[PDB]
Amino acid sequence: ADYQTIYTQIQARGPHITVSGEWGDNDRVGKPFYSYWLGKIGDAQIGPIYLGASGIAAFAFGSTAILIILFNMAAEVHFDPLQFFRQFFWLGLYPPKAQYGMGIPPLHDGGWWLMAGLFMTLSLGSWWIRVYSRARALGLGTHIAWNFAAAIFFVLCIGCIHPTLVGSWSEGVPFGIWPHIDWLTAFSIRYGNFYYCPWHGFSIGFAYGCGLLFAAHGATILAVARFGGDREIEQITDRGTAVERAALFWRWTIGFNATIESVHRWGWFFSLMVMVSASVGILLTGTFVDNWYLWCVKHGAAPDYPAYLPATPDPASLPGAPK
Amino acid sequence: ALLSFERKYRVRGGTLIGGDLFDFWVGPYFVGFFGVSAIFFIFLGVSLIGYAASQGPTWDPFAISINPPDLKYGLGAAPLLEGGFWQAITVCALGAFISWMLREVEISRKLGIGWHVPLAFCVPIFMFCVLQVFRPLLLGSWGHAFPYGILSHLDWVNNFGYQYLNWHYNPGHMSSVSFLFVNAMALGLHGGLILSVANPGDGDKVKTAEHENQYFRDVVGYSIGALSIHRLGLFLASNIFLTGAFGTIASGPFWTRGWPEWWGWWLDIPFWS
Amino acid sequence: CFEPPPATTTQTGFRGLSMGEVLHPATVKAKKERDAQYPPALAAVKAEGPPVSQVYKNVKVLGNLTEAEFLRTMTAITEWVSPQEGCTYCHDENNLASEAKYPYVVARRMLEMTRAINTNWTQHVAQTGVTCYTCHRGTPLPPYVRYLEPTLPLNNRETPTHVERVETRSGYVVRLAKYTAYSALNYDPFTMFLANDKRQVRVVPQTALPLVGVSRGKERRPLSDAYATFALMMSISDSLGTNCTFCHNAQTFESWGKKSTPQRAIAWWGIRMVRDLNMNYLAPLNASLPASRLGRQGEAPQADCRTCHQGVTKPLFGASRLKDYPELGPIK
Amino acid sequence: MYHGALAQHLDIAQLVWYAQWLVIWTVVLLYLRREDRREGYPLVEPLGLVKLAPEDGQVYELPYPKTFVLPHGGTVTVPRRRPETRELKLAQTDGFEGAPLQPTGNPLVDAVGPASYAERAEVVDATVDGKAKIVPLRVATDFSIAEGDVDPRGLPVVAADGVEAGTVTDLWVDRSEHYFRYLELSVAGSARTALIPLGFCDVKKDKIVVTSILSEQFANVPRLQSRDQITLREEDKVSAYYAGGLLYATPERAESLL
Ligand code: BCB
Ligand code: BCB
Ligand code: BCB
Ligand SMILES: C/C=C1/c2cc3[nH]c4c(c3C)C(=O)[C@H](C(=O)OC)c4c3nc(cc4[nH]c(cc(n2)[C@@H]1C)c(C(C)=O)c4C)[C@@H](C)[C@@H]3CCC(=O)OC/C=C(\C)CCC[C@H](C)CCC[C@H](C)CCCC(C)C
Ligand SMILES: C/C=C1/c2cc3[nH]c4c(c3C)C(=O)[C@H](C(=O)OC)c4c3nc(cc4[nH]c(cc(n2)[C@@H]1C)c(C(C)=O)c4C)[C@@H](C)[C@@H]3CCC(=O)OC/C=C(\C)CCC[C@H](C)CCC[C@H](C)CCCC(C)C
Ligand SMILES: CC(C)=CCC/C(C)=C/CC/C(C)=C/CC/C(C)=C/CC/C(C)=C/CC/C(C)=C/CC/C(C)=C/CC1=C(C)C(=O)c2ccccc2C1=O
Ligand code: HEC
Ligand code: HEC
Ligand code: HEC
Ligand code: HEC
Ligand SMILES: CC(C)=CCC/C(C)=C/C=C/C(C)=C/C=C/C(C)=C/C=C/C=C(C)\C=C\C=C(/C)CC/C=C(\C)CCCC(C)C
Ligand SMILES: COC1=C(OC)C(=O)C(CC=C(C)C)=C(C)C1=O
Ligand SMILES: CCCCCCCCCCCC[N+](C)(C)[O-]
Ligand SMILES: CCCCCCCCCCCC[N+](C)(C)[O-]
Ligand SMILES: [Fe+3]
């Protein structure tokens, strides 16, 4: 085998490297340190990290968001430290349980939720800036930032935007380990089975496709590691055997092929798409589609099956059956 | 018909079995024995689907569904229209997937590169076997497998989940979902990063390996490295199924209550009860 | 941590939809055997004599029965409800017609109720029927009952830990999860759903599109509702020791017809029925009970699916004494 | 009255269903598909005599030229006409347009099949600094082997024949990514030195095993031109050399495994 593809046989150590940006070179804190174990499967340098405004801001809003969550959770167990560690997964900060429509809800029934939500959005936004700006500073393109915005957007979608359209904060996503999860079910239940939402279907394809592609792209790269397949950049400006080989491998299997640059594009696009497709489907739910399954049946695509146990009529819809 | 640079790589050899026999190309496609068996299975499998579906009530691609047998039938061969087709379809499926795979190996030996791709491809095959071969064997009927229908397969996923009350609490599902998500993200960063460096915009200079690395240190304080992010992305995508398998496989054979209740092992420790 | 194979599976849906039950064989055998403790029917007695209405003093309900038959009941009642206590539980050693002891009046209402479940609620109980035993299990206090707050342990025959006590503010979440199969759903389907005829279970729209007039703003139902019904379902499921697919085809939880099993329809009635017993029978007993019996808000203990079912699709695995004690329903 | 209802049998979700599809196909087909054709296109096969002429379908499939402005000067335009000039020591084994080719010489030396290189630029790959990226330790004095790993300097290289083929003399580091990329060894009973990509070496405490080729074959490894620096084409040469032996080191390599 090419053991290099599994872990690094002989680790190198050398002077630390610093590429300067139009700004903030003075905002890089830390004394870079090395880890030998990590060094086997990745670069061994941990650090330093750059601070700056946007970042520090992000830490700021974020943390606020957090105390808010933790505190309410903490209350959820009448401040018992031990039951706290214990029930953690079960604790959460909920959206308004009552219907207030769009009204800023009482602190107790959802008020603290919308605050958390706010600081988290502020926190996401600042971090976005960091991502975009550090790219700009080092003379790189905005691509990562543009994928990231798509993810921010989905989060916003399911947090503010969808609740804003239908007019009920009661639909946002609670905060907590199990709670954010039960939301999924409650959301799907209410809207008629998310499996029937075509955009859930689009998202899934992209997500699975994501899986398929990183697996294939990764593997393809290790498989040409020997020809320096890993130095992707120079393989673009100056095609080499590595990519030539990697191209024909895919050409001969599937009939077609990408380039070393284009594959990253298909990867980036797929990624972005997972999030874009999701936003569409959420924006369409409730606003224009009440029941996904029925909308599917409305339009003829749902499958149907025979009865196994006998067909069972809705007791309610019978004569003089109670309410 | 050949890429600018293809010609030179097109030499005989690397066959796994077969030799010079099928060692050739048709179009851009390399053939090989497994290319010959891949086609065979496909052909059979797609004809099985056509015939089976031709005996069902609908042609709407969405609604058509070819189903496994009733539990009653155990692990035995079932009536044709009542599960049989499903069985035979399953076999062709595996026939095709496996040839596909081996084929990829010969393509790789010819090119002189690593076997990582077919290798990586085993992961999805293995999962198909978990859902369709191993779990039902474990449960004792082929009737626990999933149906072949564009939407109807989602109906199996659904009910399957719901049989365990809240599938989301299945711990191998959590790990599974979690790799699904990281990997989708890593893909975006990996690809955005590459493109950010080779496509800065305007007429600025293409960047360097060094810039890729300052970017992430600056951001998250740490950069994995060019070769290592390919090794990692291979690892995250794979673990989507490697870890999931466990969750799937435990559902029924190793566990029968609702998944949430599984967490009692934590919640119910006597110390803090 | 894990239960081991094999596993008994059953099919409740068309081939390939993955619908059915998943049971651990031992779990079932333990329940099978605990439920087996149902005492056999007392030997038949022949009806000789005058109706006890002539014969005894204060006999309101079973006044059609002869002495022999009546006594038989009393004995059966004794065995099902308060066997360790004996007749003295409800009776005055000397005045067998004395209403002094609360268990007597209760037992009296109980007879009426019982006789109602068996007569009115056939839609749910069929030719099976309920007897005192069903709920009581040989104890005056049924082991599976509910207050207006989540109580724990589930089985009142167990002794609670510090934290489980309804007084300990922090164990609330645990107490709640235990009611809803370990879920983090923030609701109590009993108070919301089962004590009242107040709230509606159903939450899914019956049209593909959002009908104008009910889809916007405060005109809407909160999403809470959805979590609530989910939670209720987890409780029902866990109470019958089953899974959603015992009842619905997850393709569309909301549909009936071939999407639902005959069981769904039965549980439908079960809802009503428990609403009845609750509102009209079990709750009004707070007037006749000792404070020892009441809950934190002066409520009587009431029933849920679990009360009768005790974790089994059919309570007592389908055992019946119906034919054996006609005194308890059904009535002409 | 429903929300989303458009006509009597049309809803906005339907229209969005098609727009989505259309958006997907547009990007995939007209964008991504053309981008994948930036290298290697246009395809190859015969010309007529006067047949210089453009081939309709060949223009449509390619994207517009992209110019890369390089870090240390120059530019690159893609896609662009890049024919393979070099004569290939190979012969067609049959009539089929898709039959394989066969080496007519020593494929390792002739650089055909797995032993092929790309016509990479005859330039040293640089660091961001403008210095050479991949150099021997001998020169990259600032670099070292990490505490605990093998210091392969001085060990023998053992070929697939199981025979000592030479002794490791140095290592080549990538100054740009801090990663070792080649071992330099001195060849037995010869004048030269060769490099061998780390992926081909199995580093052990007492030997370095290289199964790719046979001892006898180390002698033909492509020779570098400056002794302390390597051009990009050279990397391809060297790397392909050893890959080639995976198929060609022995007469049985090229055959069926079973
Ligand atoms: C454990 C859960 C499972 C699951 C859960 C699942 C969900 C929940 C969803 C899908 C969806 C889909 N799945 Mg299912 N699935 C599918 C195929 C599909 C596609 C119809 C669609 C999108 C797939 C995608 O893009 O992935 C990535 C691959 C890419 C991006 C390359 C293109 C692949 C091409 C789409 C596959 C086409 C298959 C064919 C139409 C039918 C076979 C070909 C004919 C000639 C025989 C196959 C091929 C198989 C197997 C194993 O053989 C499988 C197994 C399973 N899926 C499991 C049973 N799948 C989605 C959908 O829209 O369903 C209707 C969706 O929402
Ligand atoms: C019973 C419920 C069901 C359900 C309900 C459901 C809902 C309700 C939603 C999905 C969605 C999705 N589901 Mg579906 N689902 C999926 C797959 C998917 C995803 C492809 C897609 C979600 C997009 C996503 O990544 O969100 C994950 C990505 C996120 C959340 C990005 C966040 C980015 C952010 C910047 C990160 C912020 C980090 C900060 C550090 C946070 C700090 C916090 C502090 C400050 C407070 C599969 C594979 C299956 C299978 C195998 O069957 C399935 C089954 C089901 N889903 C059931 C049918 N699903 C979504 C969708 O597409 O809807 C159409 C959606 O909304
Ligand atoms: C209500 C029911 C639910 C459920 C039930 C469920 C089940 C029952 C299972 C999963 C599984 C999975 N779920 Mg989950 N799920 C997931 C995500 C996931 C995936 C990580 C995971 C793996 C999918 C799989 O195994 O397919 C397998 C895909 C295969 C096998 C692909 C085979 C491809 C083949 C190798 C090649 C085929 C080629 C084509 C035939 C030919 C086409 C060629 C043409 C194009 C030329 C998410 C992200 C969500 C969200 C956001 O809520 C969710 C919600 C839910 N899931 C619900 C709670 N989920 C599985 C898992 O691991 O659970 C632990 C699982 O067993
Ligand atoms: C489809 C494509 C996808 C996609 C894409 C992308 N995803 C990105 C990017 C792109 C491209 C970025 O560029 C960006 C980034 O930077 O990448 C490194 C990023 C990110 N994706 C994260 C999480 C994530 N992505 C998910 C999913 C997908 N992502 C989807 C699938 C999920 C899921 C599934 O749940 C998760 C959880 C974060 C790591 C990260 C920044 C978060 C942030 O904004 O941080 C905000 C920062 C904070 C809140 C700081 C908190 C510090 C703590 C609280 C300190 C506690 C102690 C307290 C302070 C004590 C004080 C004491 C006092 C005395 C002093
Ligand atoms: C964790 C890593 C993952 C992973 C990995 C990799 N994945 C790869 C490779 C790697 C690395 C390959 O090298 C190989 C390939 O070439 O890539 C181009 C491949 C491939 N990934 C495909 C589909 C794909 N991957 C999925 C998932 C993951 N992939 C996970 C995420 C999913 C999901 C999630 O649903 C799908 C559907 C095919 C495109 C493709 C070859 C198909 C084939 O075999 O060709 C040969 C077979 C045919 C062309 C048709 C045979 C038709 C049968 C007989 C008749 C129908 C049978 C079937 C029962 C119908 C049921 C349908 C019903 C549910 C609707
Ligand atoms: C005589 C006779 C009958 C001959 C027949 C011979 C024969 C076997 C024919 C087979 C015909 C068959 C069955 C064709 C089916 C082909 C199939 C399965 C096609 C699936 C196509 C799909 C959906 C792929 C999904 C993944 C995807 C979106 C890929 C697009 C992007 C690409 C091309 C990725 C591949 C890829 C990756 C991963 C790289 O890393 C890489 C790195 C550097 C350069 C190129 C590449 C590269 O192309
Ligand atoms: C509470 C669960 C009871 C137990 C234990 C026993 N009996 Fe009872 N008894 C009970 C009630 C509610 C009534 C009223 C019946 C009605 O139809 O209204 C009765 C009645 C009697 C009587 C009639 C006395 C009289 O009215 O003249 C007798 C003689 C009697 N019960 C006997 C009896 C015996 C022997 C018990 C142990 C075997 C026994 N009872 C237990 C309620 C309860
Ligand atoms: C479930 C539907 C029940 C059936 C069937 C019967 N009873 Fe019951 N009973 C039930 C509850 C929920 C309670 C209240 C809680 C409490 O412990 O009181 C009761 C109570 C009684 C009592 C009072 C015991 C006590 O409070 O100390 C008696 C004597 C009693 N029930 C008698 C009884 C008889 C005779 C029944 C068959 C005719 C009968 N019950 C059925 C619930 C259920
Ligand atoms: C039978 C014993 C059931 C099992 C097991 C589960 N459910 Fe159920 N469900 C059942 C009934 C009788 C009803 C109707 C209640 C009424 O008052 O009319 C329901 C309803 C639902 C609904 C929503 C119904 C609607 O909006 O039309 C949902 C969403 C639902 N049930 C979900 C569900 C789940 C997730 C279950 C497993 C935990 C579950 N049900 C089990 C009866 C039965
Ligand atoms: C005692 C007073 C009961 C309560 C409370 C509930 N149920 Fe019940 N149930 C009861 C009996 C005696 C029977 C048996 C019917 C038979 O033929 O033996 C049942 C049965 C069911 C079933 C039928 C299951 C089957 O295999 O067909 C279901 C689905 C059911 N019950 C559901 C159910 C639910 C949801 C309840 C709470 C709302 C509930 N039951 C309460 C007696 C009693
Ligand atoms: C500005 C206008 C006027 C109003 C805007 C209103 C607005 C923007 C609202 C936005 C709402 C939004 C975006 C809501 C989104 C909800 C979402 C996406 C929820 C998802 C939650 C997911 C999960 C898993 C949350 C988990 C939370 C936790 C487990 C917190 C844990 C915190 C810890 C452990 C802190 C530990 C600190 C220590 C020092 C140890
Ligand atoms: C060549 O591509 C890439 C890298 O190589 C240097 C990275 O290190 C990283 C950094 C990854 C992490 C987890 C810090 C990314 C994202 C990447 O795309
Ligand atoms: C993931 C499930 C996806 C199912 C999506 C089905 C979309 C059907 C749309 C049909 C539109 C009707 N039509 C053709 C007249 O426009
Ligand atoms: C969510 C599923 C959407 C995935 C879109 C799939 C794109 C695959 C495109 C294959 C390209 C075919 N080709 C060669 C003819 O262009
Ligand atoms: Fe890459």
XYZ file of N, CA and C in Angstrom, chain A residues 236 257-269, chain B residues 195, chain D residues 31-38:
69
model
N -4.121 22.411 -10.862
C -5.067 23.174 -11.699
C -4.352 24.038 -12.731
N -16.127 12.742 -17.053
C -15.261 13.125 -15.981
C -15.208 14.635 -15.722
N -14.676 15.026 -14.582
C -14.520 16.417 -14.167
C -13.060 16.748 -14.317
N -12.702 17.943 -13.859
C -11.285 18.323 -13.799
C -10.922 18.454 -12.315
N -9.692 18.642 -12.037
C -9.393 18.886 -10.650
C -10.047 20.122 -10.105
N -10.221 21.171 -10.905
C -10.890 22.342 -10.340
C -12.387 22.059 -10.235
N -12.953 21.611 -11.356
C -14.418 21.409 -11.420
C -14.989 20.488 -10.359
N -14.242 19.481 -9.957
C -14.798 18.658 -8.930
C -15.182 19.396 -7.650
N -14.399 20.418 -7.267
C -14.550 21.274 -6.103
C -15.778 22.138 -6.263
N -15.985 22.475 -7.517
C -17.195 23.169 -7.848
C -18.397 22.211 -7.645
N -18.331 20.992 -8.171
C -19.481 20.109 -7.962
C -19.628 19.887 -6.440
N -18.549 19.827 -5.712
C -18.667 19.642 -4.286
C -19.335 20.837 -3.571
N -18.858 21.989 -3.909
C -19.340 23.238 -3.359
C -20.792 23.378 -3.728
N -21.106 23.091 -4.975
C -22.496 23.274 -5.376
C -23.390 22.341 -4.665
N -11.324 26.655 -4.514
C -11.769 27.605 -5.500
C -11.396 29.010 -5.066
N -23.425 24.851 -17.004
C -22.293 25.364 -16.245
C -21.267 24.237 -15.968
N -21.567 23.362 -14.988
C -20.638 22.294 -14.594
C -20.126 21.394 -15.676
N -21.017 21.004 -16.541
C -20.568 20.164 -17.620
C -19.516 20.853 -18.492
N -19.663 22.113 -18.771
C -18.665 22.776 -19.590
C -17.373 22.978 -18.838
N -17.502 23.351 -17.580
C -16.297 23.470 -16.734
C -15.462 22.160 -16.700
N -16.101 20.999 -16.716
C -15.311 19.786 -16.619
C -14.437 19.574 -17.816
N -14.723 20.331 -18.883
C -14.032 20.189 -20.135
C -12.967 21.236 -20.335
N -12.426 21.765 -19.264
C -11.333 22.685 -19.395
C -9.991 21.982 -19.649
